[PDB]
């Protein structure tokens, strides 16, 4: 039941530790590989931390599908509403 803004704040904190990008730079429109220059391996660390701290599990196969912050939230939004 977490809103879009709340997921952004959680992701931004994970972004800061994994990469060092400031939380301000993280918006649902910025792309991981074009704007946020986050490689595939750094995305894996993102999924591991979120799966640990928040419990949202994102497998490796679907990880490549997510491209910007917005669809990651949508993926997380999809998981929580199914419950």
């Amino acid at each position: 039941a977490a809103t879009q803004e709340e997921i952004i704040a959680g992701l931004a904190e994970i972004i800061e530790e994994v990469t060092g990008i400031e939380p301000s730079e993280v918006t649902p429109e910025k792309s991981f590989v074009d704007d946020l220059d986050i490689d595939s391996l750094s995305m894996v660390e993102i999924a591991v931390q979120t799966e640990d701290k928040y419990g949202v599990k994102i497998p490796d196969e679907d990880l490549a599908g997510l491209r910007t912050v917005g669809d990651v939230v949508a993926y997380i939004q999809k998981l929580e509403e199914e419950n």
Partner: protein
């Protein structure tokens, strides 16, 4: 509330540093240097209860000609065949040798006596040798002194034109080995300090912090060498060249590693936005127990050598442990004190490159996301060194392990240019009885014993009273012919209660075939004396072949016992700290597995690339340090894992990787390269042990710690910390606003 111990260290940093430097200076000034103490406190090469030395000593006692167990051979070589002038030179040399009673105990003059002259002369006639029984068992300070005296007597004298005298033998080789090790220790220390200075500059990018870690290293090494010299001088324990070389190198390596650990944790705390006091306290709380356990593991592992049988390994045990304890005490007490007192002054210990660790983030992610593949690859890379086992062979001659110009090596070359190895390594056997064995019956009994010894395969000649020159010589008038008298004097006890045999093998006696032939001759002599009046007699057999047989018998026991003891004790220490059985088992088993890669790399570099096969000593001396240091690195990683595990397994591991990735890699690199720095020594075996430990620790730093143990931890999950109760992942937290 600051803990009392780091607070005490910080508040009284100056008194602690002053006390440490004063104690170290007193230790280094009161007693002689480590070179002198090691020279005086050299220990015998063979155990005092070895059958070979006991047999040689018994032969000397019953014949009442010497009390020692070791002998050297003086080889005379001339361009032209030796003649009258060479014989006069030899006679004068023998008289002078017998004059020096304290050093030379007995000279077996075979060339001078016409009865056995043909056996002491080369077939070309240009060479002749005499066996001289120097005082003191081989490897002792007395043995080295006697070797030097014999060398001086044989060399520093007038010589006939074209005739040169060389002294060779096992005792001379041991003396030259210890001399070369002590001479090369200075070069080893210089090269080690240069290498660690360069690499500390590379990993710190600041001259001041490099000078600070160099000061800590100097303090630790000086304390270790001082305490070892102080205890050796007062005869607390013996010393060898290996012991001193390992002591200095390990002291430097461990001091550098502990300084690196402490400063790395302090700088990480500073990078995490902490004041100097808080950063210092965090560094202590996060590294003091780790470095204490590292020092304890290394000290105990080296102390495990004290429970072996061979004197060279057994002697190394206590000094290494005491040096390890003193350096860890210096790092634990003077380390934090120095760090505080220098961080109080400006930007002294502040990190220079304010840069994160991206690559460690990547490798942590890889090792926590795909543990199985990385673990399989690491295990395969560790076990790939096992394919070098079939081609692994070890030789026992120390000819190739010393420079080609030492007097022992040139004497060896001169002897082997004219004499076979069997001639230069005769096997001595005697039969001791309670009767006067100067009767014809006893004479053909001795002849039968000689024939029985001869019939054994691999035996060339047997010299005794009946066969003075190896060939058979009964006329009652011949018993007092002034030649049988001399033969009896040279081959029988003065009271006639014992008879001596000089067995010469056919081929190379210094091999496993020679070892089997030793038991063959013992059995043959026992059969010969059976059913004869000589039945109630004791048989003693000795020589170089027997001594090396005893050494070969010992080696397996030493290796197995030290490996097992070090393994158990390291595992116990890891259990005590980590409070987890599975984590300790993983830490120990990982480096146990990496030992295969270490051995494979060593025998690939030496046997195949360099061409000199590994000495029989290198593996027992290397396994202990490899296990200790690799377990220490794994323990540091696991302790950081336990610190960060509150966030949950599989992210605490990543944080441990990014926290103790660069610092521990730098420590592993400095340790591996300072151990590889002993390859510059003239003594090859010292370089072999150093390079073996260096390659093993390189593999441990690069693979078994960065890839093996974290993947094992991720795979085991909650079970890695058993029996401690930990959660695989924390309670899912609500998304922050």
């Amino acid at each position: 509330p600051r803990p009392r111990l780091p607070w005490f260290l910080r508040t009284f940093a100056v008194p602690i540093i002053l006390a440490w430097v004063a104690v170290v200076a007193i230790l280094n000034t009161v007693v002689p240097t480590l070179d002198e103490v090691g020279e005086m406190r050299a220990v015998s090469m063979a155990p005092n209860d070895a059958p070979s030395t006991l047999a040689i000593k018994r032969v000397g006692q019953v014949f009442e000609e010497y009390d020692t167990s070791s002998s050297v051979m003086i080889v005379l070589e001339g361009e032209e065949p030796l003649g009258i002038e060479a014989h006069a030179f030899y006679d004068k040399m023998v008289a002078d040798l017998r004059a020096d009673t304290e050093h030379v105990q007995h000279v077996q003059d075979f060339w001078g006596d016409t009865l056995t002259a043909s056996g002491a002369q080369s077939v070309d006639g240009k060479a002749a040798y005499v066996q001289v029984y120097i005082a003191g068992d081989q490897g002792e300070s007395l043995a080295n002194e006697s070797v030097e005296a014999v060398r001086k007597i044989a060399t520093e004298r007038e010589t006939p034109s074209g005739v040169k005298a060389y002294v060779t033998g096992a005792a001379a080789t041991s003396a030259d080995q210890r001399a070369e090790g002590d001479a090369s220790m200075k070069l080893i220390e210089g090269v080690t300090f240069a290498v660690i200075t360069v690499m500390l500059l590379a990993v710190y990018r600041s001259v001041i912090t490099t000078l600070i870690v160099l000061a800590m290293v100097v303090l630790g090494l000086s304390g270790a060498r001082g305490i070892v010299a102080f205890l050796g001088f007062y005869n607390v324990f013996g010393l060898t060249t290996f012991a001193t070389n390992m002591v200095v190198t390990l002291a430097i390596a461990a001091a550098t590693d502990y300084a690196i650990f402490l400063i790395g944790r302090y700088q990480e705390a500073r990078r995490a936005g902490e004041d100097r006091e808080s950063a210092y306290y965090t560094m202590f709380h996060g590294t003091a127990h780790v470095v204490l356990a590292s020092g304890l593991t290394i000290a105990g592992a080296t102390l495990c050598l004290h429970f072996t049988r061979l004197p060279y390994f057994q002697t190394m045990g206590v000094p290494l442990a005491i040096g390890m304890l003193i350096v860890v005490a210096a790092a634990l007490t003077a380390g934090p004190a120095v760090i505080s007192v220098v961080s109080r002054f400006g930007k002294t210990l502040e990190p220079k490159r304010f840069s994160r660790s991206p690559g460690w983030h990547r490798v942590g992610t890889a090792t926590v996301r795909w543990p199985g593949a990385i673990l399989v690859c690491a295990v395969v890379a560790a076990l790939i060194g096992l394919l070098a086992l079939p081609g692994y062979y070890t030789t026992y001659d120390d000819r190739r392990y010393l420079p080609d110009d030492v007097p022992a090596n040139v004497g060896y070359d001169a002897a082997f240019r004219h004499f076979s190895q069997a001639k230069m390594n005769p096997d001595l056997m005697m039969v001791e009885t309670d009767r006067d064995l100067r009767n014809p019956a006893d004479f053909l009994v001795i002849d039968k014993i000689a024939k029985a010894l001869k019939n054994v395969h691999g035996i060339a000649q047997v010299q005794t009273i009946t066969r003075p020159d190896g060939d058979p010589i009964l006329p009652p008038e011949a018993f007092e012919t002034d030649d049988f008298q001399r033969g009896m004097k040279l081959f029988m006890s003065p009271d006639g209660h014992a008879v001596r045999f000089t067995i010469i093998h056919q081929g190379d006696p210094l091999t496993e075939e020679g070892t089997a032939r030793m038991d063959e001759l013992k059995v043959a002599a026992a059969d010969a004396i059976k059913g004869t009046p000589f039945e109630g007699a004791r048989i003693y057999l000795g020589g170089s072949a027997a001594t090396y047989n005893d050494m070969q018998i010992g080696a397996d026991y030493d290796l197995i016992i030290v490996a097992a003891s070090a393994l158990i004790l390291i595992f116990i220490i890891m259990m005590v700290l980590t409070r987890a059985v599975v984590a300790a088992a993983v830490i120990v088993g990982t480096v146990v597995l990496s030992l295969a890669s270490a051995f494979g790399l060593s025998v690939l570099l030496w046997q195949h690339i360099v061409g000199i096969p590994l000495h029989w000593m290198v593996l027992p001396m290397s396994v202990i340090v490899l296990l200790a240091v690799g377990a220490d690195y794994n323990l540091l990683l696991v302790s950081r894992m336990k610190e960060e595990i509150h966030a949950g397994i599989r992210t605490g591991i990543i944080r441990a990787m990014v926290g103790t990735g660069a610092v521990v890699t730098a420590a592993g690199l400095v340790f591996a390269f300072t151990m590889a720095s002993m390859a510059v020594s003239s003594l090859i075996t010292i370089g072999q042990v150093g390079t073996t430990i260096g390659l093993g620790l390189l593999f441990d730093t690069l693979v078994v710690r960065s890839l093996m143990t974290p993947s094992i931890a991720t795979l085991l999950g909650r079970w890695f910390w058993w029996p401690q109760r930990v959660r695989e992942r924390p309670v899912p937290s609500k998304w922050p606003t």
